[PDB]
Swiss-Prot record:
It comes from Cryphonectria parasitica. The lineage of its organism: Eukaryota, Fungi, Dikarya, Ascomycota, Pezizomycotina. Belongs to the peptidase A1 family. It catalyses: Hydrolysis of proteins with specificity similar to that of pepsin A, prefers hydrophobic residues at P1 and P1', but does not cleave 14-Ala-|-Leu-15 in the B chain of insulin or Z-Glu-Tyr. Clots milk. This is Endothiapepsin. Keywords: Aspartyl protease, Disulfide bond, Hydrolase, Protease, Signal, Zymogen. The chain holds residues 90 to 419 of 419 of the full protein.
Length: 330
């Protein structure tokens, strides 16, 4: 089997991407944030505290003839940005882009943190990291991909995120028309539960490539590119007037600037992030200070190849017995 679904930016900055997911019978379609940095499929629901729902579409398990309470199971998750959610668990039929999994754990939120409530466009998350990170207790549950894998034509999924435009998540096949050149594959460590890999270096604009190992995670659920402070300083030094602002929470730059590209290495291959992809717009409405899309990972404890980086590539998440990542230009 295969599946293919379009993923759509939630706003004009590409802060996140939403993908429609069919849950239950008859289907209830929710728009979920596909997150290769976590491993829970959780949704706003009829059980979510009413004051914490503000415009989201909810899953109502009592209206699904295939829903079953997973007795005794609870979940609770905290994300790298300080947000969180928790609740109980149903199993139900879940379909993405025509690919169907029966008995998928659907984690129904009883509580969500304010950042989720305040974002009416995201109805929940669909985790695509390794199932060892799933938070369901006392019986850990499998991700949608883990449940589907054995049925897929090939045990892979691909992320093709758009810049200020829709893109595609495919399951079970490589669309050879979706990228240019060849796909370069690179080793993955699953020891922390992530799609963790080592970039071979970077360049700023037309500058020379610096060969240096940068361990990080491929994380579709993180907006920005978080890299070591040395690398980030080297980038922003090429933007007149850019500076790190402790009060804003990162590097800012004059909105009048033209940003240089940023290149990262995948083996001997190179992925070029155009400068425009690094512009996240005014820090507040009407400001001439703009927020940068490359930020320091100091204090986060891991480097993160978030959407800023991934949207510049066609990315293969190869879930074979020994997982690997692939990157191609597009």
């Amino acid at each position: 089997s295969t599946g293919s679904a379009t993923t759509t930016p939630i706003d004009s900055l590409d802060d996140a991407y939403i993908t429609p997911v069919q849950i239950g019978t008859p289907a209830q379609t929710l728009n979920l944030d596909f997150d290769t940095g976590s491993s829970d499929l959780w949704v706003f629901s009829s059980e979510t505290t009413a004051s914490e729902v503000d415009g989201q579409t909810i899953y109502t398990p009592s209206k699904s003839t295939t829903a079953k309470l997973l007795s005794g199971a609870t979940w609770s998750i905290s994300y790298g940005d300080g947000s969180s959610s928790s609740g109980d668990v149903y199993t139900d039929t879940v379909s993405v882009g025509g690919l169907t999994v029966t008995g998928q754990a659907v984690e129904s939120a009883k509580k969500v943190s304010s950042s989720f409530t305040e974002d009416s466009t995201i109805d929940g998350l669909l985790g695509l990291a390794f199932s060892t990170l799933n938070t369901v207790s006392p019986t850990q549950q499998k991700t949608f991909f883990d449940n589907a894998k054995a049925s897929l034509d090939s045990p892979v999924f691909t992320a093709d995120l758009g810049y200020h435009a829709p893109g595609t998540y495919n399951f079970g096949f490589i669309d050879t028309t979706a990228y240019t050149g060849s796909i370069t594959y690179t080793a993955v460590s699953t020891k922390q539960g992530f799609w963790e890999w080592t970039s071979t270096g970077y360049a700023v604009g037309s500058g020379t490539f610096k060969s240096t190992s940068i361990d990080g995670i491929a994380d579709t659920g993180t907006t920005l590119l978080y890299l070591p402070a040395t690398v980030v300083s080297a980038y922003w030094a090429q933007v007149s007037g850019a500076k790190s602002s402790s009060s804003v929470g990162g590097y800012v730059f004059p909105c009048s600037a033209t940003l240089p590209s940023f290149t990262f290495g995948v083996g001997s291959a190179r992925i070029v992030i155009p400068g425009d992809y690094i512009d996240f717009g005014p820090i507040s409405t009407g400001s001439s200070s703009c927020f940068g899309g490359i930020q320091s990972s100091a204090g986060i404890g891991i480097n993160i190849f978030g959407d800023v980086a991934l949207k510049a590539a066609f990315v293969v998440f190869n879930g074979a017995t020994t997982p690997t990542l692939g990157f191609a230009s597009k």
